[PDB]
Amino acid sequence: KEALETDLYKRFILVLNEKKTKIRSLHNKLLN
Amino acid sequence: MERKISRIHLVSEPSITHFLQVSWEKTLESGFVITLTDGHSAWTGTVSESEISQEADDMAMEKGKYVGELRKALLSGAGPADVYTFNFSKESCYFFFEKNLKDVSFRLGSFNLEKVENPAEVIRELICYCLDTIAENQAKNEHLQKENERLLRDWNDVQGRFEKCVSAKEALETDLYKRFILVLNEKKTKIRSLHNKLLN
Amino acid sequence: VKNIILSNKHDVVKPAWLLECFKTKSFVPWQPRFMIHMCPSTKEHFAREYDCYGDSYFIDTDLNQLKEVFSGIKNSNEQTPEEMASLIADLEYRYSWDCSPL
Secondary structure, three states: OHHHHHHHHHHHHHHHHHHHHHHHHHHHOOOO | OEEEEEEEOOOOOOOOOEEEEEEEOOOOOOEEEEEEEOOOOEEEEEEEHHHHHHHHHHHOOOHHHHHHHHHHHHOOOOOOOOEEEEEEEOOOOEEEEEEEEOOEEEEEEEEEOEEOOOHHHHHHHHHHHHHHHHHHHHHHHHHHHHHHHHHHHHHHHHHHHHHHHHHHHHHHHHHHHHHHHHHHHHHHHHHHHHHHHHHO | OHHHHHOOOOOOEOHHHHHHHHHHOOOOOOOOOOEOOOOHHHHHHHHHHEOOOOOEOOOOOOHHHHHHHHHHOOOOOOOOHHHHHHHHHHHHHHOOOOOOOO
């Protein structure tokens, strides 16, 4: 159970970081 | 000081049962003291290592086999098919035991016992030892039963806990994906709003 | 197929894409699931619309789609038990996930 939880959380957090980088990149263009 | 009490039926007096008590310090090989009683009289004798070795040499076989046969005969460790005959001459106080085999018999051993002036003392000692061992065995059985009951109760409780947890595992497995979907959908809604604003 | 993949000039598509196209009798847009390979033009096209993984930025995700996305990402061992636990706790606290029973 601990291994499954850790794996799922790592995958989800990686996807969330990818989405956050996309968000930051898109926002960076607002000033331009 | 190991001791063993057995019941035997002498051929001379088959209508009554005699009690043979064999006591040894460490092993039957070193030596043992035997006592034959019938509730009214007692005869006590001793056998040493030298006597056992001499008997084994006379019977021309290894000491181990002779000791095993003595254990099977005197200590009542006989197998499924093993007949032992015990004879005791009271007038001469000569007690021997033999192994019956079809139509032939082997004089397994013989000793010269002597009467004890106070059979009552030895009878009382034997009865007291029997009562003490009975009490000790009863206490041990009670303790073992208590331990078994406790172990069974704990096992049942742990089984119930495992039954709950195994399903909780799949419940969490299902919940995590839904939570991730909700958060990712919110983030993608923010992404869509930002993209629309940029397009505008 | 391996030779075609190495020569980055064509797109390799699973047969499931054609089967689905036949099922709906229409041209379905490409998805990372059906694409075994991506040419530089197609890679650039997917980079803007889709995440590096098999996930999108605009169209939402469902249970099956998220399962496939998690299938695409392979396990990695750059994390540590202590730091992983700290990150998990921070993630739960930030989004108010302290009501879980486990």
